[PDB]
Write a protein that binds this ligand. Structure first.
Ligand SMILES: Oc1ccc(Oc2sc3cc(O)ccc3c2-c2ccc(F)cc2)cc1
Ligand SMILES: Oc1ccc(Oc2sc3cc(O)ccc3c2-c2ccc(F)cc2)cc1
Lengths: 223, 8, 224, 8
C-alpha cells in the first residue's frame, strides 16, 4: 500500500469505484423517502469501496468505523456533486432522479443545502475536474475527516497528494499550476465538510417524527 | 453497530 | 495585490496581524469572559481583514459575507496557533489559559475544547511557522464564503506564497506540495470545529446563559 | 448591520 506507483494508485481507486444506484422515483415525505432509501443502499457499497481504498484495511476495525461515521455524508455529497457536473442547475442523485433547485423546496430546509451542492458542482465544472482527481479527493475525505479525532494514515495521504501532482504534471501543467490546482481542490473539501455539517443537522431534524437502521447509526454517530 | 459488522 | 512578491505578501500579512487581547469558574462567568473577549477580538479582526491584500478590492457586500462565514474559524485558528507552545491547554488570552477540565464548567464546551486541543497538537506536530499561519488565516477569510474570480486568484497568490516559504526552508519539491496538502486539510477540521462551535453558541443563546453583544448576535444570526 | 459600520 505504501509502495504503489502514482499510476497504480489511480487505477486502484478507479477499479474500487462503487456503482451508480437507481432510485424509486415515479410530497416531502416521499422525496425524503427516496433520498433516505437511496443513501442507505449506497452506504453498503461505500463500506466495500472503503476497504478497497489502499491503506484503509491496514487500520484497526475501530479506526475504520470512526472514519466512515465521520465522512459518510461527505463522500455521498462529493459523489452527487461529481455526477451532477454535466447537469447545470440540477442534482443527479440517480440516473432516474434528476432534481431541480425548485424541486428542493418540496422539503423545508433542503433548498439551502441544494444550493450549496449546486455551487460545489458548478465549481467542479469550472475547474473541469477529472475523474482521476475525483477518486483521489474522495479517498482523501475518507482518511482525513476523522484522522485527528496515525502516522500511517498521513503517509498514505501524502501518496495521494503525490498522485494528484502526478496527474496535473502529466496533464501538461507547469509546476506553479500544479501547486495552485492542488490547493484549489483541497480547499473545496472544506466546503464539502460544511455542507455535511449543515446536511447532518438537517437530517437530525428529520428524526423528529422512512428512515433505516444503518442510516440512524450514521446519524447517531454525530451525537 | 451495523457498520462494524458490515466491515466484517 | 496580485503584483505583490512572495516576500512582500508575507510581510504584508505579518504587519496586518491583530493584537493579542487580555481577558477581564461557573457556567455564566466563563461564558461571560469568552463572549467579552470574542466581541473585542471581532473589532480587530475586521480591521485585520481590511489589511489583507485584495480584500479591500472586494465590494462591501462581499466583505461582509466573507467575515460572517469565517469569523469563528478565524478566532479558532488564532486560538489554536497561540496554544501551540502550551500543550494540553488553550490560550484564549495571556491571563486566560484553560485546560480541558475547565471546559466542563460550560455544558457542551469540553467537546469543542478537545477538537481545539487536537488542532494545536497537530500544528505542533507539523511545526507550523508564523509565516505559514498568517497565510492559512488569510486563506480561511477568502475561501470560507466564496461558494455561498478575483478572490480565487488572490488565493492562488497565497498558495504561491506558501510554496515559496517551504522552498526557502530547504524542503524538496516532493516535500513542498506534500506539506501544502497537509496544511490545507487541517482547514477542513477547522471548518468542522466552527460548525460545531456555532451550534453550541446558538444553544447558549436559547438557554440565555449570558447576554451576547448585538455584534456577536449578528455574526451568529448570519448562520441561523 | 453593525458589521457594515465597522468595515467603513
Ligand atoms: O436535504 C438534504 C440533506 C442532506 C443531503 O445530503 C445528501 S447528498 C446525497 C447523494 C446521494 O447520491 C444520495 C443521498 C445524498 C444525501 C442524503 C439525503 C437524505 C438523507 F436522509 C441522507 C443523505 C442532501 C439533501
Ligand atoms: O463553547 C465554545 C464555543 C465556541 C468557541 O469558539 C471560539 S475560539 C476563540 C478564540 C478567542 O481568542 C476568543 C473566543 C473564541 C471562541 C468563542 C467563544 C465563545 C463565544 F461566545 C464566541 C467565540 C469556543 C468554545
Amino acid at each position: 500500500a505504501l509502495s504503489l506507483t502514482a499510476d497504480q494508485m489511480v487505477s486502484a481507486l478507479l477499479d474500487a469505484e462503487p456503482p451508480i444506484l437507481y432510485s424509486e422515483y415515479d410530497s416531502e415525505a416521499s422525496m425524503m423517502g427516496l433520498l433516505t432509501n437511496l443513501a442507505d443502499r449506497e452506504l453498503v457499497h461505500m463500506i466495500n469501496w472503503a476497504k478497497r481504498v489502499p491503506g484503509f484495511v491496514d487500520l484497526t476495525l475501530h479506526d475504520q468505523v470512526h472514519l466512515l461515521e465521520c465522512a459518510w455524508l461527505e463522500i455521498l455529497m462529493i459523489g452527487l456533486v461529481w455526477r451532477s457536473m454535466e447537469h447545470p442547475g440540477k442534482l443527479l442523485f440517480a440516473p432516474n432522479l434528476l432534481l431541480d433547485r425548485n424541486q428542493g423546496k418540496c422539503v423545508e430546509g433542503m433548498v439551502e443545502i441544494f444550493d450549496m451542492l449546486l455551487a460545489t458542482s458548478s465549481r467542479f465544472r469550472m475547474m473541469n475536474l477529472q475523474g482521476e482527481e475525483f477518486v483521489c479527493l474522495k479517498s482523501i475525505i475518507l482518511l482525513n475527516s476523522g484522522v485527528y479525532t496515525k502516522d500511517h494514515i498521513h503517509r498514505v495521504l501524502d501518496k495521494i497528494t503525490d498522485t494528484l501532482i502526478h496527474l496535473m504534471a502529466k496533464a501538461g501543467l507547469t509546476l506553479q499550476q500544479q501547486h495552485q490546482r492542488l490547493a484549489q481542490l483541497l480547499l473545496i473539501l472544506s466546503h464539502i465538510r460544511h455542507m455535511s455539517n449543515k446536511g447532518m443537522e438537517h437530517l437530525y431534524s428529520m428524526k423528529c417524527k422512512p428512515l433505516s437502521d444503518l442510516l440512524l447509526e450514521m446519524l447517531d454517530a454525530h451525537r | 453497530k451495523i457498520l462494524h459488522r458490515l466491515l466484517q
